Amino acid sequence: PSHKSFRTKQKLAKAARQNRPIPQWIRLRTGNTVHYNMKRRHWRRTKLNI
Amino acid sequence: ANLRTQKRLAASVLKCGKRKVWMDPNEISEISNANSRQNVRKLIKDGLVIRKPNLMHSRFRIRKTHAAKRLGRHTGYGKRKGTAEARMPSAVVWMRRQRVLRRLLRKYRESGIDKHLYHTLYLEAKGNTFKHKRALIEHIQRAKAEAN
Amino acid sequence: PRQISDIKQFLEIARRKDATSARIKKNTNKDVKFKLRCSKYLYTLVVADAKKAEKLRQSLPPDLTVTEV
Amino acid sequence: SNKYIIDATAAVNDKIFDVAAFEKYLIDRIKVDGKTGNLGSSVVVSREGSSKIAVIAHIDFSGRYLKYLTKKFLKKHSLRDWLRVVSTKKGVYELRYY
RNA sequence: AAUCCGGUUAAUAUUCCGGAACCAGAAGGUGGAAUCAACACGGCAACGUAAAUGAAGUUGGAGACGUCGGCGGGAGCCCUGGGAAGAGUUCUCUUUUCUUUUUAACAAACCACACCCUGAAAUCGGUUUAUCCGGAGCUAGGGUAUGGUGUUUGGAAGAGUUCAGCGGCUGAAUCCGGUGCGCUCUCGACGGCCCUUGAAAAUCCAACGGAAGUUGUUUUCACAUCUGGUCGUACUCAUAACCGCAGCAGGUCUCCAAGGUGAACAGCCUCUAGUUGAUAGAACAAUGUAGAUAAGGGAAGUCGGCAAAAUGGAUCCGUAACUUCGGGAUAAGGAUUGGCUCUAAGGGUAUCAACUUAGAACU
Helix, strand or coil, rough: CCCCHHHHHHHHHHHHCCCCCCCCCHCCCCCCCCCCCCCCCCCCCCCCCC | CCCHHHHHHHHHHHCCCCCHHHEEEHHHHHHEEEEEEEEHHHHHHHHEEEECCCCCCCHHHHHHHHHHHHHHCCCCCCCCCHHHHHHHCHHHHHHHHHHHHHHHHHHHHHHHHCHHHHHHHHHHHHCCCCCCHHHHHHHHHHHCCCCC | EEEECCHHHHHHHHHHHCCCCEEEEEECCEEEEEEEEECCEEHHHECCHHHHHHHHHCCCCCCCCCCCC | CCEEEECCCHHHHHHEEEHHHHHHHHHHHHHHHEECHHHHHCCEEEECCCCCCCCEECCCCCCCHHHHHHHHHHHHHCCCCCCEEEEEECEEEEECCC
C-alpha cells in the first residue's frame, strides 16, 4: 500500500534494481556464458513475498 | 495519430470530462505536436480544443406537470401508490394542527380570553376537539358569550 | 487577517519595523483598501473617502514600499 | 423609465433587415402581460435614425427578451448563419457577422 | 497541538508556487497592569473585565463514550421568482430551453433548555408532536451564562467563473431574493429500552491550601523575535494492477450520492462523470439454453400441481372458526382507480407561502 515501512521500500528498491535486463557489453566478454537475466520477475506473475 | 494523452490533458485543463472535450478533427497534426499543459492551453486559446456544452436535461415537462398537480391533477385513486399515512403522515398533520391551535390560543390570551379559559381551551385542544382553526374560533365565540 | 478602523493606527503599524510592504487597492465602488504586510498579519484599512485616501498615501513613510493594485 | 437599443447599422447598410420589419415584428410579438398589441404607454418603440430600434419601457422588461425577439425573425428570414446578436453595453444590442 | 484557498507538472500536492494563517517550545525586549492600604476592581446576585504572585500537599473536571425514536436549528444539496451574459430551438408555439452566476481556513464584532433577582401562586396555572413543572418559589418581569457550519466586515476579488474584442493585453458581468413532513451531515433539547447501564491512559485546565516574597517585586495581558527532526506520500483498490495457477461471471472493509415517476437508496428513464470493453462475419436445419403465446377442456399429467399460470399498489366496505385475548387478519369476500374543467375545505402577516384530502360534472 501507500503506507510502507522503510524496510519494505529498501527491499522493493533492490527488487526493482535486480529486475532489469543485462548490460550488452557483458555479452561480448571473453569466456562469457551469460546471455539473458535468468532471475527476471514480473509484478503479476511472481510475487516478492516479503 | 494517438491523441489520448492530449485528451487527458485537455480534460484536466478545461475542468471537465473527456466526454466533454472536443478537438478539431482537421488539426490533428498540430494537436499531436501539443504535448504539455502550456501547449494545450494555447490550443484552447486558439479554439482548436473546445469544452462542449452539457447534454439537454430541460425541466419543462416537469414544471408543467407540477403546475398541473397543484391545481389537483394526477392525484386520484389510480395515482396513489403509497398509503395515506405514507403520502401524508397523520403525525405531521396533528403536530401542525396543535401548533396552529396553540399559537392562536395564546394569541387570544395576550390580546385579551383569560388564563382560565386558555387553560380549559388547551386541554380540550389537546383532547382532539377543535378540528381546525375555524372550529376553535367558533367555540371561543360561543364561549363567554353564553356566559356574559 | 486583521481589519483596522483607525487611520493613525495604520500609520503607527506602518511606522513599526515589522511592516514590510503596502498595497493600495482601488475598488469599483470608489473605495480604497490600504493593506500593510507585517510579520504576523495583513492589516487592512478600508477608506471610503477619496481625499482621506491620498493624504494617507502621502502620509505613509517614504521608506515603506507602496504598490499599485 | 428603462431604455433599450437594438443596433442594426450593419443590417441597414447591407439591406439585411429593414426598419419596417423591425418595427412591425416587434410590435406584433412583444408579450406585455402575456398579450400582444397592448403596448400602451408602458412600452413604446420610438426609433431614432435609420440604424436604431429604441424601446422605452416603464416596467421590468428584459433585454434578453429583446434578444429573444431579434433572433426570432433572423431565423424567419433564414440568415441566422451569417448574423448573430451580441450585447455591447447596458441594454444595447447589435448584429454581428461571422 | 496546529493549514486554508487559488495556481502549478507528461507524471507530485492540505507536501511544491503565490497569498493568507495556525501550533508548540525558548529566551530576554517594548508597551501596559498590580504593589509602601504587599498580591486588581465592578455586579444585590447569577457573574463580568486586557492584565490581576501562589510552593509542597490534596481534590475536582475535561480527555471519556450505549442503542432507538420522533422534534427543533444550521450547512451543503435539491427546488424556485426576477436581472444579466452567452448557447440550443424557432412550419408554428414558447417574455423560454439550457449553461454561468462562486467565496476557504483564519481574524474581529455581534447574537435566547440551564442559573440569578424582585414576587408569592387554588376560580391552580405554565407548557411539548410526545405531561412534565411549580410554597424545595409557578406564571409574569428584569437579568447572567453558554455562542457557530449564524449575521456583519477583514481574507477578497486582485481569485475563480462566464462573455466581448485586440495582438500577452483591453472591456464588461460575476446581481436581488424566496421556499420545505425534501436529501446528506451536524447540533440542540427531549422521550424510550436493559436480570445488557454501554473502555482506559497519555495529555490539559481548575480549585482548596498559604510556602515564599524612592526602590524593587510580580504580570495565565497586548505586542514584536527564533525554531520545528525521522519515516510513509507515484499508481491500482478491482468484470485486468489484491486473493483464487490467469487480464477467472468467484471473493474482499468503507466515504461522497443529481432529476422525474413512486411510499421508497424499489424498478424504469435521464444529468455530471465513465464506458462503448467481452474473436468476428454470413446464414436461419434438427436438438438445445433463455424467454413469449395458444382454440376447447382444466390436473385427465405426475410418486407428488414439479414447473408455469393466476393473485398483487392504493382507497372504501366487509371479515369466520379458534385463541394464551395479544392475535388470527391483507382472513375470507366485494366495489373503486384515466384525462380534463371546476369548486370545497385545511395555514402565515388587505396580502403571501404550500401539497393533502373530499366531491361535482364533462370526456
